[PDB]
Design a binder for this molecule. Structure first.
Ligand code: 4CO
Ligand code: 4CO
Ligand code: 4CO
Ligand code: 4CO
Lengths: 140, 140, 140, 140
């Protein structure tokens, strides 16, 4: 499937007392990579979609993640994101995070399969919508 | 199993432009609840265990999370944490996050099953260890 | 002046590789204490004020902070917040952060004087407003 | 003085319910720009300096910041960092954050003068040291 890649440098503050990336940081990066995928695919920013069609973004409903090896500040991560499956109102977005050894060897760092949905805010109530056909086309 | 509960107030800054908790924040809270469980169970802080026995903490190796309903600033979350299963070097730590409606009704917000391990830092290399028997006893 | 106090526990993830609170975390806490002051003083949540009168919150325009001593996970901080001065469209909000030694001795950890304003979002443009008289009264 | 520049893209999660960058995020970026300055100037990473000479990094002792205009997700910030003054054990590190209008016009977003020190961890006690002469030379 159509894959988008992005890089992410790890900062000192992104690490814990144990000297490695504090895990919630990976989710911050996964969230940026998720949105980056759609922006690169041609969708407008949520600020615009909300005005146009009520779409506030793609909130997450489920996640399955695995942490394979550690990473630390100064490491440059490479994130590869694709849509694994289009369902009805949901979609599975896969992210593979790697880093390179000075050997030119690519090591898998972590991976996550996120299940998200396009949604609208009906007043205070979040509500999922069927995946827009036009969006599927842009992402194909 | 032995369950520990803790509360967490959601702050304005913990929310996104869509006005609800930005997901990585739940993982920050899950991480605090994970450690809180061990502290409440009687283990010493990692600062001390590292000196004593080399244990740096309990890094995460895998996670399965589901987001059931939204939450926003001023909501007070209740997190319930327990150890679901002791394996060899790993353990499954379950966290249930809820909030209360003014109806006195308890709504499930999110849940996560985290797989972690007790580990040591051998120089720059993180390494898992068999779950310490003494720790299993404190947590029982 | 009217002072509001709140507590904040420091978490493992709130610390850096150097084992102490990573500074941006203090600002997260200062922001929560700022809002907590207004909530405790009786103002409604911004979600409501925006609908009622267009007020989105109190964005920061300036800050002067000093870090006196370190803090780490498990330390319980005590934050004291007050309004130091009401200007025209701005106000100076002071925050004093301390922690206690087991000696019953209170140590100053950090302090910050924040300059904020009540504001509205005119479309995409943030705009400060004269401090509402009713708010000054609630905070007095 | 020797100035180092770096870019920073603002993400959806870096914004608050008011749709603009939540302030503590600027400090995260200022901290990365501070370290980036030293790395670019040729100092080794703190992981190495701590082993070699005990230097854990450059903790902050004071800060004076001003927020000039707002920024939001997708905006690309440009951060310019330099050392404004070398004192004895401390130094003043200035950071100027800007963004560009599609007009090719550069708008100042925020600025901060941070006062930091090179330090060591003597056991649990952080301690400032006289600025290393060799470091001053690398940064010149
Ligand atoms: C999102 C929603 C309102 C959807 O509920 P709904 O309108 O009643 O519709 P429905 O239940 O049919 O769910 C829609 C789809 O999700 C699927 N789904 C929902 N939960 C799950 C799950 N646990 N596992 C698998 N699929 C799921 C569901 O099966 C359906 O898929 P499909 O069969 O149509 O293909 C409800 O699940 C909910 O509120 N969950 C909480 C969402 C939440 O708070 N997530 C955490 C914070 S989100 C804030 C955030 O970080 C963010 C980031 C980026 C961005 O662009 C926007 C937000
Ligand atoms: C942790 C480790 C070094 C373990 O590798 P190892 O020493 O070679 O040993 P091993 O592979 O046998 O794994 C140990 C156990 O984990 C189990 N395990 C590992 N991966 C998985 C997985 N994906 N699913 C299920 N079980 C798993 C494995 O089966 C074994 O369990 P058991 O059968 O003995 O009961 C390696 O998996 C690794 O480095 N993963 C990356 C860890 C990481 O970077 N996590 C994200 C950041 S952690 C920083 C953090 O946020 C933190 C928070 C709190 C705290 O207290 C400490 C840190
Ligand atoms: C806020 C504003 C639109 C105000 O501009 P304005 O409408 O043209 O009005 P004006 O310039 O007269 O400023 C209003 C007042 O601020 C005072 N002020 C502004 N800058 C300064 C400064 N550097 N030092 C001292 N006073 C200042 C100004 O003198 C006046 O005070 P007063 O004499 O009326 O008492 C403009 O300064 C601006 O956009 N600054 C950037 C704001 C920003 O992006 N802050 C960082 C992110 S804010 C997101 C956030 O974290 C947040 C947290 C909590 C919350 O409830 C809301 C948001
Ligand atoms: C840092 C220190 C131990 C220094 O105390 P000290 O060893 O007794 O020495 P001393 O008081 O003489 O201070 C050293 C210098 O700082 C100057 N200084 C200290 N406070 C101030 C202040 N408020 N305003 C101006 N200058 C100041 C002081 O005048 C002297 O400068 P100089 O005249 O020698 O040029 C003490 O001030 C302290 O613990 N402050 C708290 C530090 C803290 O917790 N900061 C917040 C978290 S730091 C965690 C972090 O985010 C981080 C980020 C990056 C990195 O690489 C490392 C850490």
């Amino acid at each position: 499937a159509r894959s988008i890649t992005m890089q992410q440098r790890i900062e000192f503050g992104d690490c814990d007392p144990a000297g490695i990336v504090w895990y919630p940081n990976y989710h911050r990066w996964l969230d940026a990579a998720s949105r980056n995928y759609f922006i690169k695919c041609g969708l407008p920013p949520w600020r615009q979609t909300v005005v146009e069609r009520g779409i506030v973004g793609t909130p997450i409903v489920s996640c399955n993640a695995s942490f394979v090896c550690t990473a630390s500040y100064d490491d440059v991560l490479t994130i590869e994101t694709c849509i694994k499956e289009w369902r009805r109102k949901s979609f599975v977005q896969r992210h593979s995070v790697s880093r390179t050894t000075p050997g030119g060897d690519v090591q898998l760092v972590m991976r996550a399969d996120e299940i998200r949905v396009f949604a609208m805010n009906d007043g205070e109530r979040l509500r999922a919508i069927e995946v827009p056909a036009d969006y599927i086309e842009l992402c194909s």
